[PDB]
Each structure stands twice: as C-alpha cells, then as structure tokens.
C-alpha cells in the first residue's frame, strides 16, 4: 500500500479530529483489536490531539503527537503501523516466513505459500482476511503487516499462490515517514 509513497506526492493534508469522531474511531479499534483496549489510554492519551493525515487513494493515517499509529483506505479496516506494532507486538496474531523470503517482502512482494510452508517458517491457524503481523525466522521484530488471502489451512494444502498480501513493510514509504510535522 506504500511501496511508492512519500509525503510530497501522497499527503494532501492533515485534519485534527473532534471528540465525537475520536470516540468512534477508538470504538472501531476496540472492535477490530480487542486486546488493544487496556492500552488505548497510553497510545491515544486524553490530553493529546488526534489527527488524520489524508493521503491519495483515500488512505488515512491516524496520528497522535506526530506519531503514526494506524492507517486505513476508504472506510476499510484499520491496520497498525509497524512502528506501533513494534511497541505493542501483541496487537496482531503472527505468521512467520522462512528467512529466504525476507528479501522479497522487504522489496514489497506479496507472500507466497512456500514462504510459509518451508522449514524455518511457522504457519499458525488463521481465517482468510485476518490482519497478521509477519515475523521472520531468526528475527525478533515484525517486518510486515499482512492480510491472509488464503486461510492458513488452504495455504498448507494448496501451497501455491499468494498466501498473505503485503500491506506495509519495513522501509516502505510509510515507514520512511517517521513523524508527521
């Protein structure tokens, strides 16, 4: 979603949200990510203004104190940024690709089922459309936010095709935008 993204050519503007809208977005974050609820006072303090950075193709980025927390496109689901996920890795269920696939997902490629079924990888049960944190064999931190395009049982069985859609990866255009300011 951010492979050729950058502030100049993609960010139209940045609106500050009213209290009515913030409570609604928090509620949607709760519904999507149940375990985030006890941490929201910490991620989005009462005291701090909440902004949406509006981007081309109806991408919105939620920011607090200039830190990028979540993003969505249209009124689709929210996805954590990788920076937020690194601070709170438990927000998302995990899938672990084999180390050979690291180079390809860091260049923006979608995850193919052999990256998840080969030795060194770890595939965990997941329904299609689940937002997952992509971990890497031998690596402590997540490198990609993905969406299951086949269920994890299908990925084991079909074993060919896109298993996981690459949505956001380390040093993509979103990653490079460290803060909004």
């Amino acid at each position: 979603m951010f492979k050729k993204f950058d502030e100049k050519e993609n960010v139209s503007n940045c609106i500050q949200l009213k209290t009515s809208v913030i409570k609604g977005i928090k509620n949607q974050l709760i519904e999507q990510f149940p375990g985030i609820e006890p941490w929201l006072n910490q991620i989005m303090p009462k005291k701090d203004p909440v902004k949406i950075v509006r981007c081309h193709e109806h991408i919105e980025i939620l920011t607090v104190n200039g830190e990028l927390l979540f993003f969505r496109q249209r009124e689709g689901p929210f996805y954590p940024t990788l920076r937020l996920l690194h601070k709170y890795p438990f927000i998302l269920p995990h899938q672990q690709v084999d180390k050979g696939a690291i180079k390809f997902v860091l260049s923006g490629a979608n995850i193919m089922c052999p990256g998840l079924t080969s030795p060194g990888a770890k595939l965990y049960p997941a329904a299609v459309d689940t937002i997952v944190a992509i971990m890497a064999e031998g690596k402590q931190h997540a490198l990609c936010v993905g969406v299951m395009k086949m269920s994890a049982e299908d990925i084991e069985k079909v074993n060919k095709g896109i298993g996981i859609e690459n949505i956001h990866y380390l040093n993509d255009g979103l990653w490079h935008m460290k803060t909004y300011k």
Partner: peptide
Amino acid sequence: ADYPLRVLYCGVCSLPTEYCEYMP
C-alpha cells in the same frame, strides 16, 4: 508486563539493527 517496547532503530538505514543485513 511493561510496554511500550522501545526498539532501537539503526541511525543509517532506520531499520531494527537485525535487518541492517538487508540494506546496502
């Protein structure tokens, strides 16, 4: 039991230092 984690990001490639390997 205490969060947020503070992950060290490399000062040149901006990645976690375990991913430096992948950035020239």
